């Protein structure tokens, strides 16, 4: 053909602009997949996957990039993927047995999967130092120390329509089996996220009234009848929720312990959840 | 709950509200009488 844009008898400028973008899109796709390989890589090929019956490491394609250094606010240059998390995962002895020796067989937990961190109950290896705001305050703290927060975004809504702006303090907690686990005594708020994160409760229903346990808010269904319904775990199972090292702080690790325990209830709280519909 | 407002103060607001509504409607009715005197808005059988 002829006209403006012709490069040969067949090639034209728009077509070669397109292939130019193909080369860029590939280089971007390869670059994006490398950024994908900074967590969990290199892959751990177990012995039972390889014909030589030896554990190995697979880079995949594209191979992972070099380690990446995140300088942190408190003056700590962390490298990603983090060495301590990889070392914890590779050395932890799981309390589970594969349902079959071949690769891809699911693990069947031996003891109690909820307290052993198996499957939906699992936790990552995180820091034990409680998080801080940019200004140095305690990031996730209960309302008894984070006294500048009051429950309820709108005072008028909380006073005249408390159903849609509730205050769950003093609410009874029920498990997936309808049994009473205790009473909510406090609310934990993230000073950065400006949201409730945990509902601290006592175990007055299934244990000691003086015991304190954190219930993650995303596992709590704060009702309209002064009852909080947790579908994750049975009411009797609130006693084994991991306790805080310090009654007034939570490390990111304990957040993974506590949310992990409730997440494990989705499969292990009662018999039959693991079992299919049919 | 309830609006924080005295039982007598609630009677006071209502009295002014009903006097203001009555004055508002009293002006509206006169305005309507003036408009109907201009051009009536309820047509007859054959229209206007």
């Amino acid at each position: 053909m002829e006209g403006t844009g012709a490069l040969t008898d067949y090639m034209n400028v728009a077509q070669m602009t397109l292939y130019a973008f193909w080369l860029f899109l590939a280089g971007l796709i390869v670059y994006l997949r490398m950024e994908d390989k900074r967590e969990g890589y290199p892959l751990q090929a177990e012995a039972n996957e390889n014909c030589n019956r030896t554990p190995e490491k697979k880079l995949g394609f594209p191979a992972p990039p070099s380690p990446k250094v995140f300088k942190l606010a408190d003056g700590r240059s962390i490298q990603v993927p983090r060495a301590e998390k990889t070392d914890y995962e590779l050395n932890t002895q799981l309390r589970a047995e594969p349902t079959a020796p071949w690769d891809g067989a699911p693990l069947e937990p031996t003891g109690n999967p909820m307290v052993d961190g198996l499957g939906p109950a699992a936790w990552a290896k995180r820091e034990d130092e409680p998080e801080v705001t940019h200004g140095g305050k305690q990031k996730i703290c209960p309302l008894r120390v984070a006294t500048e927060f009051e429950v309820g975004m709108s005072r008028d809504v909380a006073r005249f329509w408390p159903e849609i702006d509730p205050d769950p303090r003093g609410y009874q907690v029920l498990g997936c089996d309808g049994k009473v686990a205790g009473k909510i005594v406090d609310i934990w708020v993230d000073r950065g996220e400006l949201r409730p994160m945990y509902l601290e409760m006592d175990l007055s229903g299934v244990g000691s009234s003086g015991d304190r346990v954190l219930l993650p808010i995303n596992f709590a269904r704060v009702g309209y009848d002064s009852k909080v319904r947790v579908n994750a775990i049975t009411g009797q199972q609130f006693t084994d929720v991991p306790r805080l090292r310090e009654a007034d702080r939570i490390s990111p690790q304990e957040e993974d312990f506590i949310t992990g325990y409730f997440g494990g209830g989705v499969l292990y709280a009662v018999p039959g959840r693991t079992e299919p519909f049919l | 709950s309830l609006t924080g407002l005295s039982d007598e103060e609630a009677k006071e607001f209502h009295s002014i509200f009903m006097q203001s509504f009555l004055i508002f409607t009293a002006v509206a009715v006169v305005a309507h009488f003036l408009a109907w005197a201009w051009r009536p808005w309820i047509p007859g059988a054959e229209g206007y």
């Binding site: 053909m1 994908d36 500048e148 709108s154 702006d165 949201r195 995303n218 | -």
Partner: protein, 318 residues
């Protein structure tokens, strides 16, 4: 019966966050900040304060001038009737210059007001770019938002300024109206032979559809892993929690490959800005180096062929 992380049930209100301290040359922020219960259900309840500096003020002034010119010309076209303005609100427009003026400056009522509105609108969006750039730098953040905005600016400039300039007439540009700029969009495709066959329009749609696909995938995944504080994504990038692992494992088990807490936002960022960049390139190619996009597709063997169903029409003026 499980909580679906769709609305925030329990909210907690504290003092208004005045924002992170700025350097000791920035303008003071506004003093106005209030909390909204309705907005607090979806997310952060605080409304305001807002910063306004040199770039912000000048962007607002240039933009207000543009909106006043468009609005007053729109209102003048309906003989200044506010009622007729509402009746014709989607149909009225500030019309671009007619073709006879080329790239020259046309009289005010023959596209001159359009050219001034386009110039001040271009200045306001460029200053707003500098504002987004400087607000990130003032906080010590990367300039990713500004460059993503710059990518959207480039399509805006390609459509309205660069392509009409490459064509030699302000008539080719898009009028400031709701239905009229939809008329421009359709006529553009009619004139240069079905923009569907433009490959960079195809790629533009790939990244636009992939952007909605990605935000739906990512937003659903963060809500699904909200039980493990997935939405605190900055903590998960610097300290991989179980939520980051369950999000990655979910997609690794589904489609065989995953991302990280950080790399997902690189995928979404590039999909958003590639949509608007291939869009600009596709607009710049048509009219300049491709006359008819269906004929271009026929040449490169991409046009489907259709068997006989009707008697083909013949041009009487052949």
């Amino acid at each position: 019966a499980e909580y679906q992380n769709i609305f925030t049930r329990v909210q907690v209100r504290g003092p208004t966050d005045p924002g992170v301290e700025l350097p000791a040359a920035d303008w003071p922020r506004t003093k106005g900040a209030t909390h909204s219960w309705l907005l607090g259900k979806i997310g952060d309840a605080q409304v305001g304060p807002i910063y306004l500096g040199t770039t912000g003020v000048m962007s607002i002034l240039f933009g207000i001038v543009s909106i006043v010119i468009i609005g007053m010309n729109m209102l003048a076209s309906v003989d200044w009737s506010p009622l007729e303005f509402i009746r014709q609100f989607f149909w009225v427009a500030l019309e671009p210059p007619p073709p006879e003026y080329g790239l020259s400056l046309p009289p005010l009522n023959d596209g001159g007001w359009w050219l001034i509105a386009g110039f001040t609108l271009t200045l306001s969006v460029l200053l707003w770019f500098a504002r987004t750039y400087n607000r990130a730098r003032a906080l010590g953040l990367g300039t990713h938002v500004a460059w993503a905005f710059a990518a959207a600016i480039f399509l805006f400039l390609a459509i309205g300024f660069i392509w009409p300039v490459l064509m030699g007439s302000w008539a080719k540009s898009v009028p400031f109206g709701i239905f009229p700029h939809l008329d421009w969009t359709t006529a553009f495709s009619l004139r240069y032979g079905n923009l569907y066959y433009n490959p960079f329009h195809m790629l533009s749609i790939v990244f636009l559809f992939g952007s909605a696909l990605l935000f739906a995938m990512h937003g659903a995944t963060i809500l699904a892993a909200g039980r493990y504080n997935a939405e605190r994504e900055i903590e998960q990038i610097t300290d991989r929690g179980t939520a980051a692992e369950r999000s990655a494992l979910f997609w690794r088990w589904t489609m065989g490959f995953n991302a990280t807490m950080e790399s997902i936002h690189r995928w979404g960022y590039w999909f958003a800005i590639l949509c608007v960049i291939t869009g600009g390139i596709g607009i710049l190619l048509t009219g300049t180096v491709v006359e008819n996009w269906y004929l271009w597709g026929v040449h490169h063997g991409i046009a489907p062929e259709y068997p006989e169903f009707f008697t083909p029409a013949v041009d009487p003026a052949a």
